[PDB]
Amino acid sequence: TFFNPRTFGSGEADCGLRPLFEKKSLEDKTERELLESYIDGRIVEGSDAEIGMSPWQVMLFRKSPQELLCGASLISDRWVLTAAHCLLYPPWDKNFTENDLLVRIGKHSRTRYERNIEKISMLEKIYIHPRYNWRENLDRDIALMKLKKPVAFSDYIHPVCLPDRETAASLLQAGYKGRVTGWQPSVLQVVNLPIVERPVCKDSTRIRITDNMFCAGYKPDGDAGGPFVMKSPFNNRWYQMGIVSWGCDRDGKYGFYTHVFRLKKWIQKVIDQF
């Protein structure tokens, strides 16, 4: 394991294998798309997620009044990953701390209480990357949230894997497709997007793109904080390669994501400490 169970909690060893799919040797309805490229011009739009298709999905809510703020992801039984701008953004007087928030895990429907399915947790502490660049381009848009109490895994709640150098090198390549999930539909929406070459992403915006980001999608004619995941054809596990940062629907859209592997050292140091 890359993390220490003493501080990371449980879940790493069995990360990325969904109880309702891989654990039952079943594939969801669209993961095949992550391997095929359509050139018929079909509109790429978000569709309803299957039940238990993204068990690491986390909803970040304002505690009171209750309001959905951003997406996030479960990486262990007590750590959650999200975008830093979802918590901190001085230009907007935004500075949410642990007691102003709560997370809802294992949900399928955005609008109703899912008895015996969803779990609600309070936060013990929030960690923002020291060099999250809100003054310029949202470089290093990443934050960690520690749960007050560990959450119990189930068919609906399970952690995603974080990539290692080898996994990142093999999967994060232009052309390969990844999956983004988020939330007018009432259930979690899904969309598969291809990673776009850095020079092409650069060409689409005035914002300075960095090595700590990557983009995906299609040229124009949100689910900020949520995960961009890819399934490994080598070990069958789902990995979170990115965090929705800025910019993932169908007019024409280039989404920009925090490059998770590039910031893994920081993640390790933070967790190895608290």
Binding site: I128, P130, R131, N133, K265
Partner: protein
């Protein structure tokens, strides 16, 4: 002359960012707290409050200007 390797060898004394903000000492308590969980190249000398590029930032040398996340700025240097 032009500064190479995006300033990773810079030994200068520039201590102000491009936007005119004064740099904080790397040894200051607030700076060390911000640097604590980052990955710096021990080779880069964090002297006084001079601009440096310890993390290999593609944008170049920079320095802290306060003690909260994101409180840093790049310094105006001439790269090759």
């Amino acid at each position: 002359q032009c500064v190479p390797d995006r300033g990773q060898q810079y030994q200068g004394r520039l201590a102000v960012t491009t936007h005119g903000l004064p740099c904080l000492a790397w040894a200051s308590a607030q700076a060390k707290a911000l640097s604590k969980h980052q990955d710096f190249n021990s080779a880069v000398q964090l002297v006084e409050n001079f601009c440096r590029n310890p993390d290999g930032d593609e944008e170049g040398v920079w320095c802290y200007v306060a003690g909260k996340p994101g409180d840093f700025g790049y310094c105006d240097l001439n790269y090759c």
